[PDB]
Design a protein around this ligand. Sequence first.
Ligand code: ZN
Lengths: 186, 197
Amino acid sequence: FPTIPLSRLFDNAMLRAHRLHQLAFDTYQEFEEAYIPKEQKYSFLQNPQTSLCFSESIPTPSNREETQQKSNLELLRISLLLIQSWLEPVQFLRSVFANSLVYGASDSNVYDLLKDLEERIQTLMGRLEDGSPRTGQIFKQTYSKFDTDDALLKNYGLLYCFRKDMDKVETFLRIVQCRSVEGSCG
Amino acid sequence: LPPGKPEIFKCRSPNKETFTCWWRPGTDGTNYSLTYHREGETLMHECPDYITGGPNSCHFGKQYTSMWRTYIMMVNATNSSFSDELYVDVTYIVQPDPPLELAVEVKQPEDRKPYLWIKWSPPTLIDLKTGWFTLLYEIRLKPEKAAEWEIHFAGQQTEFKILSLHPGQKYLVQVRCKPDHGYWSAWSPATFIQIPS
Ligand SMILES: [Zn+2]
């Protein structure tokens, strides 16, 4: 029994991060473009109120330096929190993702991809163990929520946030694929 | 509204750590100012460098560059006091430089035909070792005579091979690159060649 190489283990997650990242870009471009389009644009960013994302109660890095500052385990974790955190909101977004001209949307039932990706990561994470304490940043699973009547602005508000969070996830894994899986990078 | 006067036609970060914005007096008219406010959080802010950019530029160095944050910018240009408004997210404004040393090589296999043989290299500014990036390359080749080019997507791979190549003609070849959710690069300079016989 040939104990799968990390090559594949990372390689495989990178595509999942990626489908999740394009999905959110496209649809959001798709959506802003159709509903909530011009001087109204960033009403989601109205004033503090509206703009902030519940997926911000997790202290994530905001530059090269400091994002290059969190250890392989430290980086892996956030990604995960993010996944779990977007497990519910995205339930309400089915509406959104369903009539999306943007292929794969419908067929690829977003809760699934999240779910899949979620396992890939614990795994990536486990393999980066051997047993020390799992100490560094966030201790407990900082699992938040926003809410649950401006209907239209709300969906939109979410799309902006998903796109953003899909991005943090891809960008992080890539660092760890590179730093650990010594080869297919440069 | 209808008018607006000065346009900010773009922003472009050469590596996801610094960005420059370029405005444009669409006006048939030291009379311009750039102010921005980061995502959410209300303070107005004046542009931070109007030197490293070329005229009609606002360059954001390092303390001003923030990942995953919307930038609300508007040029305040007065002499005729006007404005406009733009939302810039850094991760999708990246545009790198062309790859280096397009090394062509025509090869010759035992009984079959001659095929090319390209190899290249990433532009300078972007350091992949501790991997903030993913480059995505493309190659184009049109033989001397030829009209439109023929494009091959090399993928994350910096080397390449193009079969079915005839003794009789000479070609041109350019390589190019793009970071994963960003902008295509300029076409590197064409390295002409000639197939043997
Ligand atoms: Zn991607």
